[PDB]
Design a protein around this ligand. Structure first.
Ligand SMILES: COc1cc(OC)c2nnc3c(C)nc(-c4ccccc4Cl)n3c2c1
Ligand SMILES: [Mg+2]
Ligand SMILES: [Zn+2]
Length: 322
């Protein structure tokens, strides 16, 4: 477990956001890319605008954010930048659906989003389950996500890091549970069943946000949408992100070879040719249906769908030579 320094969180405390960004950070298409130094501060701003300036003890919030940063690993995709990107997407969804969600949910989900990939190594659950490895022993299913939550709680248990302490014991356990379910939901394995249920519920007319089980599903699909949102950015950003994603997939393939196994095309660096086709399959089977269902449930989320559609069209162009 890694801790931030005095200079880091106090520096973050000192930070103010540039005026121009305030309007832009509100939009779904906002790309955090050009503002690396401002990422810790962008999260603070988002938390302050959604939840309130007095929602958390400022010192504790800053200690929390900077320490979270330090427990994201220097990997190609599943890193600190991804964490902030996902959180911003959540902010955009929340702001556009503000009253559908309690203060506790909004606090929980923003923190969950920032923490949802903590200590990621760049390896899949499928990998750890085949080559145990303690993490698959401790968490038989779903496996890194269980680990990410454990990491979240560990950070909260550091001195002056517990941003939820001022909540009632009831609200404290609730928010932890909101956070646990949200992080677990970012296991893409679980997404497929979840979207099908929600599709059924919305089609039939059964969907009821006052129903906790329904509610948990809706939050789940929100988690997938945020986790996938690099497919909703501008083409040149989306393109570069895909390269970081495959950089990770190929290292895992290398290990499968490096220890004698033949990996699927996706994780085989000798099969880059098949990538455009793979990304099209991913959009058609994962991303498009996800933002479709989300738009059906939360109509203000429609520009995520359109941005995803635009990027699909860009993959179709690649495939056919244009
Ligand atoms: C099998 O996992 C894939 C395959 C993709 O393209 C074919 C993927 N293509 N794009 C992805 C993005 C933006 N985010 C993810 C992702 C989501 C949850 C967990 C891990 C990742 Cl990398 N993926 C993919 C995930
Ligand atoms: Mg994850
Ligand atoms: Zn993620």
């Amino acid at each position: 477990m890694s801790i931030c320094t005095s200079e880091e969180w106090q520096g973050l405390m000192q930070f103010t956001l540039p005026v121009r960004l305030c309007k832009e950070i509100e939009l779904f298409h906002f790309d955090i890319g050009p503002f690396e130094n401002m990422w810790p501060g962008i999260f603070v701003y988002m938390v302050h605008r959604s939840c309130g300036t007095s929602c958390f003890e400022l010192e504790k919030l800053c200690r929390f954010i900077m320490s979270v940063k330090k427990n994201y690993r220097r990997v190609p995709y599943h890193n600190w930048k991804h964490a902030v990107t996902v959180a911003h997407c959540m902010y955009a969804i929340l702001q556009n659906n503000h009253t559908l969600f309690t203060d506790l949910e909004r606090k929980g989900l923003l923190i969950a989003c920032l923490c949802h990939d903590l200590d990621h190594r760049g390896f899949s659950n499928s990998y750890l389950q085949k080559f145990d490895h303690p993490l698959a022993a401790l968490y038989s299913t779903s496996t890194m996500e269980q680990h990410h939550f454990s990491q979240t709680v560990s950070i909260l248990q550091l001195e002056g890091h517990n941003i939820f302490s001022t909540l009632s014991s009831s609200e404290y356990e609730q928010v932890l549970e909101i956070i646990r379910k949200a992080i677990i939901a970012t296991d893409l394995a679980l997404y497929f069943g979840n979207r099908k249920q929600l599709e059924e519920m919305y089609q039939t007319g059964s969907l009821n946000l006052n129903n906790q089980s329904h509610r948990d599903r809706v939050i789940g699909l929100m988690m997938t949408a945020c986790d996938l949102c690099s497919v909703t950015k501008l083409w040149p950003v989306t393109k570069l992100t895909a390269n970081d994603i495959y950089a990770e997939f190929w290292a895992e393939g290398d290990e499968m070879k490096k220890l004698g196994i033949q990996p699927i095309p996706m994780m085989d660096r000798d099969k880059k040719d098949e990538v455009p086709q793979g990304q099209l399959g991913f959009y058609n089977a994962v991303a498009i249906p996800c933002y479709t269902t989300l738009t059906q449930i939360l109509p203000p989320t429609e520009p995520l769908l359109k941005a995803c559609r635009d990027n699909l069209s860009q993959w179709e162009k690649v495939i056919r030579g244009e």
